[PDB]
Design an enzyme around this catalytic site. Structure first.
Site, mmCIF file in Angstrom:
data_model
loop_
_atom_site.group_PDB
_atom_site.id
_atom_site.type_symbol
_atom_site.label_atom_id
_atom_site.label_comp_id
_atom_site.label_asym_id
_atom_site.label_seq_id
_atom_site.Cartn_x
_atom_site.Cartn_y
_atom_site.Cartn_z
ATOM 1 N N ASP A 1 99.818 -36.567 54.500
ATOM 2 C CA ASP A 1 99.301 -36.948 53.187
ATOM 3 C C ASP A 1 100.232 -36.601 52.042
ATOM 4 O O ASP A 1 99.754 -36.291 50.937
ATOM 5 C CB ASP A 1 97.894 -36.391 52.940
ATOM 6 C CG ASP A 1 97.033 -37.329 52.111
ATOM 7 O OD1 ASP A 1 97.451 -38.498 51.907
ATOM 8 O OD2 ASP A 1 95.938 -36.895 51.666
ATOM 9 N N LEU B 1 87.396 -29.960 41.351
ATOM 10 C CA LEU B 1 88.823 -30.198 41.153
ATOM 11 C C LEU B 1 89.274 -31.507 41.807
ATOM 12 O O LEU B 1 90.052 -32.259 41.213
ATOM 13 C CB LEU B 1 89.677 -29.020 41.660
ATOM 14 C CG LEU B 1 89.645 -27.724 40.855
ATOM 15 C CD1 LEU B 1 90.316 -26.618 41.622
ATOM 16 C CD2 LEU B 1 90.300 -27.906 39.495
ATOM 17 N N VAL C 1 87.094 -29.869 46.796
ATOM 18 C CA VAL C 1 87.758 -28.651 46.317
ATOM 19 C C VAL C 1 87.186 -28.354 44.918
ATOM 20 O O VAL C 1 87.221 -29.213 44.035
ATOM 21 C CB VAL C 1 89.307 -28.769 46.320
ATOM 22 C CG1 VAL C 1 89.971 -27.555 45.655
ATOM 23 C CG2 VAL C 1 89.827 -28.964 47.738
HETATM 24 C C1 LIG Z 1 96.000 -31.108 45.589
HETATM 25 C C2 LIG Z 1 94.483 -31.211 45.788
HETATM 26 F F1 LIG Z 1 94.127 -30.571 46.989
HETATM 27 C C3 LIG Z 1 93.997 -32.654 45.841
HETATM 28 C C4 LIG Z 1 92.648 -32.676 45.127
HETATM 29 C C5 LIG Z 1 92.328 -31.238 44.780
HETATM 30 C C6 LIG Z 1 93.677 -30.540 44.620
HETATM 31 N N1 LIG Z 1 93.507 -29.102 44.797
HETATM 32 C C7 LIG Z 1 93.856 -28.071 43.928
HETATM 33 C C8 LIG Z 1 94.196 -26.794 44.433
HETATM 34 C C9 LIG Z 1 94.187 -26.520 45.911
HETATM 35 N N2 LIG Z 1 94.423 -25.259 46.323
HETATM 36 O O1 LIG Z 1 93.946 -27.432 46.705
HETATM 37 C C10 LIG Z 1 94.558 -25.788 43.524
HETATM 38 N N3 LIG Z 1 94.664 -25.933 42.183
HETATM 39 N N4 LIG Z 1 94.322 -27.203 41.719
HETATM 40 C C11 LIG Z 1 94.297 -27.567 40.380
HETATM 41 C C12 LIG Z 1 93.831 -28.845 40.316
HETATM 42 C C13 LIG Z 1 93.576 -29.287 41.652
HETATM 43 C C14 LIG Z 1 93.898 -28.250 42.511
#
Ligand SMILES: C[C@]1(F)CCC[C@H]1Nc1c(C(N)=O)cnn2cccc12
Length: 285
Positions: free
Chosen positions: A135, A14, A22
């Protein structure tokens, strides 16, 4: 609240925060591909200091309960002690940086202000818990729905001691310089007031629908110029000290631009609190 590693089926990456990524996993204890989708954070790099950062992140997010903060699901349990994982909720819409660009045409100024109001409420609650995010950017904010946003990415988050109002980070910085406050840029001094500076940059990002050509980097790089032997950070700092600011996004309502200017006040004490910004944003709708 405790997820067995054998039941966490990997799907894709992700995001790539440094020292740890992540991933999208499915919590599939029945092994039939019918289980719920989750976001799993883990350290990639190793050097016990980042492990302490990861445990801090877990404890921080675990003690956070807000509709405007990404939900903690639990931790992972497997054939350890290498390395434990943070299980959070998955937001299928993804980051607001991408959402703003995919739906420019349907998001009007009232919707942008609704997001702004929500990010603000979530920031108020972080401050009340003595947590400094460090951040705040559109890339670190998730869309739960059409009318609902949440703050995320707590990897750089620090808790403020009871005796102090700021935190001096020994590091320094490894994020794009265009979101940092001038005091973080010069002395690495992070506080609730530096999160407010960043919030103004998030207001700018929202109102430019995160368009890449007028983004905080693109516009600061153009108004910075090219010096002979002066590093980019020093030039940005000379620019901000001179009172130069990012300029109002195209078609941005005047009131929102004035609000960004308040968030970007030179000294931290002159920047409004998130609780002060809250009703302002609600009034504008
Ligand atoms: C907002 C972020 F942490 C930055 C890069 C990964 C992102 N994380 C994600 C999270 C989470 N719980 O962190 C949750 N859902 N999601 C959908 C796309 C990306 C992310």
């Amino acid at each position: 609240t405790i997820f067995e590693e054998r039941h966490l089926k990997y799907i894709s990456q992700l995001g790539k925060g440094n020292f740890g990524s992540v991933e999208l996993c499915r919590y599939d204890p029945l092994g039939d591909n019918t289980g719920a989708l989750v976001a799993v954070k883990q350290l990639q790099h190793s050097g016990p200091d980042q492990q302490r950062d990861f445990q801090r992140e877990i404890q921080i997010l675990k003690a956070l309960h807000s509709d405007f903060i990404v939900k903690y699901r639990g931790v992972s349990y497997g054939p350890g002690r290498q390395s434990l994982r943070l299980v959070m909720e998955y937001l299928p819409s993804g980051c607001l940086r991408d959402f703003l660009q995919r739906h420019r045409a349907r998001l009007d100024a009232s919707r942008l202000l609704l997001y702004s109001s929500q990010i603000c409420k979530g920031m108020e609650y972080l401050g009340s818990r003595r947590c400094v995010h460090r951040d705040l950017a559109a890339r670190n904010i998730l869309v739960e729905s059409e009318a609902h946003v949440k703050i995320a990415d707590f990897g750089l988050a620090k808790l403020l001691p009871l005796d102090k109002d700021y935190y001096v980070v020994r590091e320094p910085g490894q994020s794009p310089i265009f979101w940092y406050a001038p005091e973080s840029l010069s002395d690495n001094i992070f506080s609730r007031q530096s999160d407010v500076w960043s919030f103004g940059v998030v207001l700018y990002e929202l109102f430019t629908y995160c368009d890449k050509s007028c983004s905080p980097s693109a516009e600061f790089l153009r108004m910075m110029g090219s010096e002979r032997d002066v590093p980019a950070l020093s030039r940005l700092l000379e620019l901000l000290e001179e009172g130069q600011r990012l300029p109002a996004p195209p078609a941005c309502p005047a009131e929102v631009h004035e609000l960004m200017k308040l968030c970007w006040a030179p000294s931290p004490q002159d920047r409004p609190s998130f609780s002060a910004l809250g009703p302002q944003l609600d009034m504008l709708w």
